[PDB]
From TrEMBL, chain A:
Name recorded for this polypeptide: Type VI secretion protein
Full protein: residues contained: 89 to 333 of 333
Organism: Escherichia coli O44:H18 (strain 042 / EAEC)
TrEMBL record, chain C:
Annotated source species: Escherichia coli O44:H18 (strain 042 / EAEC)
Tree of life domain: Bacteria
Protein name per UniProt: Type VI secretion protein
Entire protein: shown range: 337 to 587 of 587
From TrEMBL, chain D:
Domain of life assignment: Bacteria
Record-given protein name: Type VI secretion protein
Lineage, broadest ranks: Bacteria, Pseudomonadati, Pseudomonadota, Gammaproteobacteria, Enterobacterales
Database matches in InterPro entries: T6SS_TssF
Alphabetical list of Pfam families matching this protein: T6SS_TssF
Length: 240, 40, 240, 528
């Protein structure tokens, strides 16, 4: 009857573990309870993790935020703070972007443009409802290198935005730090992840003339709006 | 003999089952707190 | 609450972190990050106090703990006077209690309220502005004083409606949301209360609404037909 | 040996409850998000109720709920009780013949013959929207559906006197998306974007009903017996196809195995938590409680009217103040025999309870024919079963199904729906009957891609999302299933339309590279 006692004891401990969450953390979204939380975070469908390519368990730290229908600046601030505590950040709304036009504004007789369309000249239109600006600032070289293109903080932030903002809005990223924390632009016969970019970080060495320098980090965007329309062959056509 | 063993066993099973339904509210509140930190 | 946990052993300082703020090496799985943590659990003791349990040989831990007061007499709290403010500053400073102290407030309980658990879980899938019924219900979850007056205030919400706003600023076209709420003015002590309620609601909406969206609040006083409008935006915007 | 069996038996049960991991809380939440994910799906079919044509002067409406019982099925010789989910305007006409042919012009033509009653009063006959059911195998009827519904080119009414070339103004349309039936007692939720998906994957036959609209504008001479209409369609109807007089049927409707249980007087002797509800003649081993419709008794305060708790919780309002109005609530759980027990949470109460049939032999039911329809109508309508009856379909209760279900609902869910793996994974939540056809079709999803849509309106930049899905046509009954699937998928996708962005569905048929699309899904709603 030793097995009777053994089995009952075993079940007791399993039952105890059942309701002790910390015990089951197992350094990742491996337990059912961890997955349950991810479910509430709208990440419960298998196969979705593969579209993120990050340690998805990271998002649990943001769980209370993901329960909201909107995505506030409070969220972006949290993302930056979480990844590299010490780094400060600020968010501006209605960041302006220029949008190319499909057609120029022209004058016609048969099918003229009505002012109800609020037309603009034919080269570019403005967009102040599609982007926000996320500005970062650090107090040490370590954090700076992490934020620069090729760094691990840069990558992680984009990995999180991928899910937190998704397709809702694009984010323009820039970093404001003392010149003394930036590298001297140098050439190389071979490119590298940490190599300075012409229009973002490639600051020239100063001849022993620190002020704060604003550099670009990049831009977050999920959908590239490329062209594969394949017009149409047929369509939904029920008269009802 | 086995009837007596059964009753003893059933008692133990009762207690284990009761525990499952006893510690449930603990995990329940813990989960809610994790989502809404002010809750508790 | 526990503010900090740091111990000491043969490995030097033991840098434990709070569990609920997911641990870096634990969740992020990266180098130069700790794998030591703690969680706190509280149970109700025989005196009604909370017994704090720490969820972590002869390792020594230094615990930084903030406390408060327990089951003090109902009457005493309403007749308590204040003593001299510590004279840290060079000038002597006297004190005056400007109001009877508010006694400790506990979260609502009847039978543990599985309905409350369900209310919060359900809320996580709803937009607070979807209807008057939802708005009343959700706001009510914060009325931990069980004040009939606060009930009447919330019960004065008759209808919730919203519209898209098309508005210009600095030559740019911005999107926003018009939130209109109809109130029964008899639930408030005139304009004084209606205004302050609206001021709070306006602020809340700002913290709830999504990015690149301005929000305005309109409150209608049904018995008269007049309204109070909040048309303002405190968010940094249009950086360029 | 007996001790061993006892021990192992009980230990198994305990282990199972643990592994299930928290249905206790999850199910209660799910029911308030998904109003129909805590119920089984009762068996159902489509039955023709055909009146005597010879003598019928006026149209008659068959009341919804009209019952057609079955013949004895399985041990105990019990019967099923099916009832119509729609009211049917029986007209004094019937299908005489179905002939597939072709014109010298190359256009395929389907000629459908009909006949009228000797006393048909055309001022009474409801020739507004003639409801015709396609009673033929899916590989052929799926084609027929589109060929008549979307490819129609011309319609002619052939009258006696060689007057065959009478052009008729009218068209065909699907009725499977109608709001009026819903096939379930769900007139409050109206979540068509979801329900249509369960229906597509389960009782697909509901979508094989096509109405012919505009006959109200057609004047015909009085007469007796046969006449014909010609459906001219803009295609070379695929050469390989059967045709038969039995392919088309007018007088038929979907019926479901649901019936009223006796409203036995429920009495209590204290507030002993929850009470067990059970009908008389439970001993048959077949009857089962499906749902409680109403609770009203008689107490010292007069009629003891109770309010379904859910009427408060569904709103999610001040339950604190709504609950005092004598609410009631019900729960269900399988007993030791696998049958569901119903519990009541709150003097005699009259409980109005709808039931169904539970466990039974599957072959016995499949081979069972229907008995005569209750004689309510003036015409002794005959009963013809147009499709082998289904057996009860139970929802999956495994792994993390319920949590997947909750994740699915969020508006933000759309953001992760950008790959075939996810799309298949979510559609799978509705496949409660895992047959070969559904798997072949589900696995036909090869790829999913997202593209951005940008347009200006009134000076404002409008954002949207193009969701492109590539399908393997081999998993479908040709274009028929592809287009029906597509239309349904579009209606579903629209659920995720938002004030701040619109959706659009595009499908690619990979075997040909044929692209088809639907119009934009606009819905000015808050980002739930």
């Amino acid at each position: 009857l030793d097995i009777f006692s053994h089995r009952l004891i075993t079940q007791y401990y399993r039952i105890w573990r059942k309701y002790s969450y910390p015990a089951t953390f197992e350094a990742g979204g491996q337990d059912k309870t961890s997955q349950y939380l991810l479910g509430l975070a709208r990440l419960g469908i298998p196969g979705c993790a593969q579209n993120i390519a990050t340690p998805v368990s990271r998002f649990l730290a943001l769980l209370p935020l993901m329960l909201l229908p909107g995505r506030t600046a409070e969220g972006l601030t949290s993302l930056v703070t979480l990844l590299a505590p010490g780094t400060q950040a600020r968010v501006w709304h209605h960041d302006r972007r220029r949008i190319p036009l499909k057609t120029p504004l022209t004058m016609r007789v048969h099918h003229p443009v009505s002012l109800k369309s609020r037309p603009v000249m034919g080269d570019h239109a403005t967009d102040v409802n599609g982007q926000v600006l996320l500005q970062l600032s650090t107090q040490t070289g370590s954090e700076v290198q992490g934020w620069l293109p090729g760094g691990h903080l840069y990558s992680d932030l984009l990995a999180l935005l991928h899910v937190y903002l998704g397709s809702r809005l694009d984010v323009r990223l820039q970093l404001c730090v003392e010149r003394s924390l930036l590298p001297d632009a140098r050439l190389s016969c071979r490119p590298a992840a940490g190599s300075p970019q012409l229009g973002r970080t490639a600051v020239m060495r100063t001849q022993a003339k620190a002020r704060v320098m604003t550099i670009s980090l990049g831009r977050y965007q999920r959908v590239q709006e490329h062209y594969q329309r394949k017009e149409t062959q047929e369509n939904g056509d029920y008269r009802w | 003999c086995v009837e007596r063993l059964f009753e003893g066993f059933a008692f133990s099973m009762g207690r284990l089952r009761q525990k499952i339904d006893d510690d449930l509210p603990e995990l329940t509140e813990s989960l809610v707190s994790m989502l809404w930190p002010h809750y508790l | 609450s526990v503010d900090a946990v740091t111990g000491s052993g043969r490995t030097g300082s033991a840098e434990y972190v709070p569990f609920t703020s997911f641990r870096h090496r634990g969740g992020m799985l990266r180098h130069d990050a700790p794998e030591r943590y703690y969680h706190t659990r509280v149970k109700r003791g025989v005196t009604g106090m909370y017994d704090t349990w720490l969820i972590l040989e002869r390792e020594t831990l230094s615990l930084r703990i903030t406390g408060t007061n327990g089951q003090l007499p109902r009457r005493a709290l309403q007749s308590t006077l204040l003593d001299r403010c510590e004279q840290v500053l060079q000038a002597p400073v006297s004190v005056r209690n400007l109001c009877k102290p508010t006694l400790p407030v506990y979260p609502p309980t009847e039978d543990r309220f599985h309905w409350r658990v369900m209310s919060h879980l359900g809320t996580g899938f709803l937009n607070m502005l979807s209807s008057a019924e939802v708005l009343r219900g959700t706001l009510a979850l914060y009325n931990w004083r069980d004040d009939e007056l606060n009930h009447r205030r919330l019960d004065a919400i008759l209808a919730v409606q919203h519209h898209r706003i098309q508005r210009f600023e600095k030559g740019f076209l911005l999107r926003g949301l018009d939130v209109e709420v109809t109130l029964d003015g008899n639930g408030f002590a005139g304009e004084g209360d209606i205004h302050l309620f609206g001021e709070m609601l306006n602020r809340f909406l700002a913290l709830y609404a999504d990015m690149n969206q301005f929000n305005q609040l309109t409150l209608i006083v049904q018995p008269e037909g007049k309204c109070i409008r909040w048309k303002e935006n405190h968010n940094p915007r249009l950086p360029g | 040996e007996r001790l061993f069996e006892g021990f192992a038996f009980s230990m198994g049960r305990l282990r199972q409850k643990i592994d299930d991991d928290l249905p206790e809380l999850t199910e209660s939440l799910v029911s308030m998000l998904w109003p129909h994910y805590l119920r089984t799906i009762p068996s159902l079919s489509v039955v023709a109720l055909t009146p005597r044509l010879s003598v019928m002067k006026m149209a008659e409406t068959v009341p919804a709920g009209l019952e057609v019982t079955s013949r004895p099925v399985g041990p105990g010789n019990t019967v099923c009780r099916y009832r119509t989910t729609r009211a049917i305007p029986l007209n004094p006409l019937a299908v005489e013949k179905v002939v597939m042919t072709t014109e010298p012009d190359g256009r395929s033509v389907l000629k459908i013959g009909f006949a009228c009653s000797e006393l048909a009063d055309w001022s009474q006959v409801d020739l507004h929207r003639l409801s015709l059911y396609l009673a033929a195998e899916a590989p052929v009827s799926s084609t027929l559906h589109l060929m008549m519904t979307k490819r129609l080119a011309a319609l002619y009414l052939r009258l006696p006197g060689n007057d065959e070339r009478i052009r008729i103004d009218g068209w065909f349309s699907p009725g499977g998306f109608a709001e009026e039936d819903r096939l379930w007692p769900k007139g409050d939720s109206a979540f068509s974007g979801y329900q249509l998906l369960l229906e597509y994957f389960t009782f697909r036959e509901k979508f094989m009903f096509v109405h012919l609209n505009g006959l109200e504008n057609v004047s015909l001479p009085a007469g007796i017996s046969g006449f014909d209409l010609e459906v001219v369609l803009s295609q070379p109807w695929p050469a390989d196809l059967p045709v038969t007089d039995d392919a088309l049927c007018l007088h038929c409707v979907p019926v479901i195995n649901l019936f009223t249980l006796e409203a036995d007087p429920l009495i209590i002797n204290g507030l002993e938590s929850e009470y067990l509800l059970r009908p008389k003649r439970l001993q048959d081993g077949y009857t089962e409680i499906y749902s409680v419709d109403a609770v009203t008794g008689s107490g010292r305060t007069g009629s003891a009217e109770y309010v379904p708790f859910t009427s408060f919780r569904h709103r999610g309002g001040m339950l604190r103040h709504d609950a005092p109005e004598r609410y009631y609530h019900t729960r269900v759980k399988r007993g030791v025999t696998g049958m569901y027990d119903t519990w009541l949470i709150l003097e005699t109460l009259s409980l109005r309870i709808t039931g169904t049939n539970g466990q039974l032999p599957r072959r016995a039911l499949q081979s069972t024919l229907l008995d005569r329809c209750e004689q309510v109508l003036q015409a002794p309508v005959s009963v013809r079963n147009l499709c082998k009856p289904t057996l009860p379909v139970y929802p999956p209760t495994e792994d993390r199904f319920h949590w997947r279900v909750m994740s699915h609902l969020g508006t933000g869910f759309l953001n992760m729906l950008s790959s075939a793996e996810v799309l298949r994974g979510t559609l799978a939540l509705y496949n409660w009957r895992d047959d070969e056809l559904n798997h072949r079709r589900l696995d036909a999803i090869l790829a999913v891609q997202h593209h951005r849509i940008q347009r200006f309106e009134k000076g404002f930049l409008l954002r949207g999302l193009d969701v492109e899905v590539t399908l393997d046509g081999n998993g479908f009954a040709g274009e028929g299933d592809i287009h029906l699937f597509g239309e349904m998928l579009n209606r579903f996708l629209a659920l995720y339309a938002d004030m701040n962005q619109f959706n659009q569905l595009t499908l690619i048929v990979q075997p040909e590279g044929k692209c088809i699309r639907w119009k934009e899904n606009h819905n000015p709603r808050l980002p739930g």
